[PDB]
Design a protein around this nucleic acid. Structure first.
Ligand SMILES: [Mn+2]
Ligand SMILES: [Mn+2]
Lengths: 209, 206
DNA sequence: TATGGATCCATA
DNA sequence: TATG
DNA sequence: GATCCAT
């Protein structure tokens, strides 16, 4: 899989330029989002393009999550204090990791969005809430680009559609990443939908795993 | 329907307390949200409570919209300039209306929310863009409270679930109102459902 | 009465 | 179409 | 948007 579109707020730009931990975080993310391949035996991600919305979205995220968790030690389901403790209403953040160098601690919150475009709004708002409350130092959202989305489940989050809203993160360190497949071909099998598209293995939860 | 819950930002509070036009607008939207009744032959709204998530949601906003449009002259599906003209990406807001008292103009934008709770985030953000871009002077969202939502299609917007995010509108004139039915009872009807998404009636080729 | 999806619908 |  | 699904 490969990164094609991207928006980085001025605050995130600053971090990326002068902070080694953030640079590291960003690189781990980038490598992970580029790792998904299809089919399982391929070196690149070729999406079946027989028709509009022909592919499921779940199997697409597995390799990226696996690398983040197993190779880079990122955790899943990190509850935000303001939601879990304070307002006691709201779910956790998708992916999370604490980077450390001596006395410096950098907490990065991330969301791999393949849900409906409206869900991307909730994901952005939750990360924004965490950022505004000083719980994370950087927020990231990964999502397919419009071209790729065309062959995935209808209405799935896509870079272009959420783009008009990136400006609501102004004043905060935020990175939006849009990925695309390397090839489009009807020769590869369809990414399964529903039950058949799952497995998703035992994940590394922050509560611990 | 009846208004059971409500959150009014401090900016909206000032408008409501001081501005006549905003008061009129607020008044109009409230009568409108109270409007929807069920069944048709009734003067109140009674939700069928036979089972959790047993009622569809589509018919619920009809009367609300009717009043606003016909009786109050609100405009449906108003496209915001930032989205339609500037960004050329994104759809319109549910209802909009300009209140005029010569020299003074107040534009109010509103979103009736019965879509999935995630969709409420898109609605709130769109109203936020409008506000931020000075296209509206007040934003309002209408949505069922959890108690009522319990008998509507699963995961539809409910006041309590969007509540933890109300703070993202700090500094903007925003009003969030949660409506509820007058009664939960036996009935001749049950609000019908569409074949959307995972409904057993939807076509799934897989 | 929790909560983030995943998948399909209607109408431009 | 693209968008709620 | 509107219906359900997996935890
Ligand atoms: Mn709308
Ligand atoms: Mn609406």
């Amino acid at each position: 899989m490969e990164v094609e579109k991207e928006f980085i707020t001025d605050e995130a730009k600053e971090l990326l330029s002068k902070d080694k931990l953030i640079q590291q975080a960003y690189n781990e993310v980038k490598t992970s989002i580029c790792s998904p391949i299809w089919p399982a035996t391929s070196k690149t991600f070729t999406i079946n393009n027989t028709e509009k919305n022909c592919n499921g979205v779940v199997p697409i995220k597995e390799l990226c999550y696996t690398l983040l968790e197993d190779t880079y030690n990122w955790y899943r389901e990190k509850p935000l204090d303001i939601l879990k403790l304070e307002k006691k209403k709201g779910g956790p953040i998708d992916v999370y990791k604490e980077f450390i160098e001596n006395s410096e601690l950098k907490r990065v919150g991330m969301e791999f969005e393949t849900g409906n475009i409206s869900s991307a709004h909730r994901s952005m708002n939750k990360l924004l809430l965490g950022l505004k409350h000083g719980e994370i130092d950087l927020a990231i959202i990964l999502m397919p680009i419009k071209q790729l989305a065309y062959y995935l489940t209808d209405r799935v989050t896509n870079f272009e559609e959420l783009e008009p809203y990136f400006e609501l993160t102004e004043g905060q360190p935020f990175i939006f990443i849009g990925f695309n497949a390397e090839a489009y071909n009807s020769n590869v099998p369809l990414i399964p939908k529903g039950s058949d598209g799952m497995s998703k293995r035992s994940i590394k939860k922050w509560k611990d795993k």
